[PDB]
Amino acid sequence: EEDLTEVKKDALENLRVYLCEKIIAERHFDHLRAKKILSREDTEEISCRTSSRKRAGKLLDYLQENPKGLDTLVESIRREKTQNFLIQKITDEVLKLRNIKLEHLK
Amino acid sequence: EEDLTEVKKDALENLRVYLCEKIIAERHFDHLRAKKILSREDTEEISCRTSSRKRAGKLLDYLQENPKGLDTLVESIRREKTQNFLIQKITDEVLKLRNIKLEHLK
Amino acid sequence: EEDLTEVKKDALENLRVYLCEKIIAERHFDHLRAKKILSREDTEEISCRTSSRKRAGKLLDYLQENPKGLDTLVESIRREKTQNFLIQKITDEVLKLRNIKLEHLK
Amino acid sequence: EEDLTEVKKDALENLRVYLCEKIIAERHFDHLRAKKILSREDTEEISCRTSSRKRAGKLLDYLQENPKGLDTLVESIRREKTQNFLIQKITDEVLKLRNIKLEHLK
Amino acid sequence: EEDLTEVKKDALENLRVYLCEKIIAERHFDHLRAKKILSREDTEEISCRTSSRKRAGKLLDYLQENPKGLDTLVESIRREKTQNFLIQKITDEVLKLRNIKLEHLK
Amino acid sequence: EEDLTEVKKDALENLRVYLCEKIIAERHFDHLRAKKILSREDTEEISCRTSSRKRAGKLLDYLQENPKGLDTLVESIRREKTQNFLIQKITDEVLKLRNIKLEHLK
Amino acid sequence: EEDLTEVKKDALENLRVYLCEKIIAERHFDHLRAKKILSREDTEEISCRTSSRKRAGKLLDYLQENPKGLDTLVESIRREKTQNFLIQKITDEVLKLRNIKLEHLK
Amino acid sequence: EEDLTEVKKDALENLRVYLCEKIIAERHFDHLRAKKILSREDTEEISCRTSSRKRAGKLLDYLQENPKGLDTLVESIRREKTQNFLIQKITDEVLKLRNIKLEHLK
């Protein structure tokens, strides 16, 4: 019904908390692939002045605007690296979505 | 009796003075979790123009509108960080509430 | 029609991902030749502070500017070294161009 | 007739679009020589808070106030570096001037 | 209860101090095995600029992320090398966990 | 009477001047232990942009907050390194406290 | 007669011009010592948004409110650094004071 | 007439261009001697973040302050190194001074 794209934000708002977990990937593996749809000048800006906490929050904040919001997810399971502390969580992020999402059906 | 929600503000007004102690957490640990219920654009703006004293006052000021007033409290005792200079104080913030709260029973 | 110089960026935006295969050649072989038309101070700057990932991105990022976009290509097939991992890719990079390029004709 | 000094703005306003092509020279090559007539404190300020997009626009925006408007031009063709992606364009920048300039004669 | 994964950080925060005993293994033995789950470009970066103290802090800091945190441990007891200064400590590191962990049960 | 925690600031405001003697320990030995009670993201932030003077000022400024104000002290006399330039001074820092402290008794 | 505290402003007003000479010391050596009597939050703000020209004027502007106005003077002659381009000037700043001061006696 | 100290800046503003010849001496020989009168913290700061182009500009920019403006000169002719590319230039720098200087006499 095209309503889910909103609940992702909540899920994200609920998962906003996990800004200290594999978010450093913004310097590691986020910036590179996601740019396929992500911004350009902001990257320069977003990166220039952060403790890796702000940009962390920054990087995430933008994604609520998009409808799809399925790329940090595919990119984390892809490219190897960490397949647990984010992925078990990602399933939990999926859950956080799932939970919030399925709840909405009520 | 749903009256306490107000006495927090007093407690807060009484504690308004402690605007220089662990309030910097607005750049540190406040903005992140609390946004679970907190504003969105204000954050951007609240932050945009401050020496960390205004935004300090700002951030604090916003919380009197809410009835609950209990999260800075749970967020500081949790997430580790500082467990005294604010928490003994927090117990004192609790006191400032408590004192203000209990006196109301008179 | 001088429109292709742009689609190269797309192709590059589509190939930005392969920032991990033979991009290290900036240390191995890119810096020396490309300088024939490439930057001067940034080379110093671009280089000074990277994990070989950022500079990788940097070096690539700079070329979307230039119209020709055909030198890393000629330089990789030239100077021997690698002719497969990147060159079959280079054909694919040509493809990524070709694909995006030919697509534009529709 | 001293009217051309105005048409450079529009040409620049027409060329305002090319804020992504060899404008980075602001860090690379612009700041150093142009300062012969260019500002002093702003440079510090202009540079202090930009993603290289603002300062880009900044650096350009200032030049409309001057009458001569001929230095970024002479500076890019000299000092080596890029003699094409901007220079052909510069001829086109000259054209953008020329086109507009000659048009004015009508 | 999946709460233990946190107290490890404390334990680690409590053991953050012992950043001088056998942390040089970041060159001696730590980098090779741990990479199985560990980070890739940071390794390049993390290493690139350290007195062996920051990277020390770095490497460790990264692990508070991961939920398990049981690998520097198995890798130090195995692969021979040192079985005492780090290991009695490791048991003490286990203690630091054990202490903080069991305390949590209160 | 819990009034002393304030004069430490003064003592510190009076010792603010000694930001050049062994404050560099912010790299040499401060960051590591003090983090037992110290801030996390600012450490990232505080460090990222300083001549070792700002951060020097930064590091000290945060502690006026804390009530105990007794850790840089124990940390400097311990862990070896310098026991004179800082410690004779530290006793003087103690004096600066002591002086200011005892003065308050009047 | 306590009238001198005012002509210093004039001196400063007449010395306001020299806002480009050893004023950068605001980052270099001013902020640290002078804070013994100087502000606190402003420093943060004063610094937060300047090209070093405003803050220059800022830093200077504040000192007119004070009566004594002798510290930048004693601070510049001491702490080594520059003993001429400011100090000959400082004697001249003394002169600017002196001139105006002595003039006032008429 | 003490006016020359100003024209040096012009001369310097006219020689600001030669920020590419023997300015790297900012590492090769400048820092050590000139420090007899030069900055302290900025040396740390000026150095920390430059492609050798900015610090180049930085180092020079500071000197327009100082009245004498005669030390980079004596230091380059002495201490061996290069006596030609810059010294013929230095005489030309002297010229640039001389030219601008003598012109002022008109």
Short mmCIF file of C-alpha atoms in Angstrom, two decimals, chain A residues 18 20-24 27-29 81-85 88, chain E residues 36-42 45-46 62 64-68:
data_model
loop_
_atom_site.label_atom_id
_atom_site.label_comp_id
_atom_site.label_asym_id
_atom_site.label_seq_id
_atom_site.Cartn_x
_atom_site.Cartn_y
_atom_site.Cartn_z
CA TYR A 18 22.46 1.80 17.01
CA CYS A 20 27.74 3.13 17.32
CA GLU A 21 27.60 -0.22 15.60
CA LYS A 22 29.13 -0.75 12.13
CA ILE A 23 28.18 2.82 11.23
CA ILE A 24 31.88 3.68 11.05
CA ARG A 27 34.54 5.64 6.45
CA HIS A 28 34.77 1.91 5.78
CA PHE A 29 32.27 0.65 3.21
CA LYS A 81 33.30 -7.80 6.63
CA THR A 82 30.91 -8.20 9.54
CA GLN A 83 28.06 -10.67 9.12
CA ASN A 84 26.82 -10.72 12.70
CA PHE A 85 27.01 -7.76 15.01
CA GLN A 88 21.90 -10.51 13.51
CA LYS E 36 38.42 -13.45 9.61
CA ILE E 37 35.73 -11.15 10.95
CA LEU E 38 37.74 -7.98 11.29
CA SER E 39 37.88 -4.73 9.25
CA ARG E 40 39.86 -4.21 6.04
CA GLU E 41 40.68 -0.60 5.14
CA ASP E 42 40.96 0.66 8.66
CA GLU E 45 44.60 3.24 8.13
CA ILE E 46 44.65 2.15 11.77
CA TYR E 62 36.64 -1.63 17.43
CA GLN E 64 33.43 -3.20 21.83
CA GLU E 65 31.23 -3.21 18.79
CA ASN E 66 31.18 -6.92 18.09
CA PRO E 67 28.79 -8.76 20.34
CA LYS E 68 30.84 -11.83 21.21
#
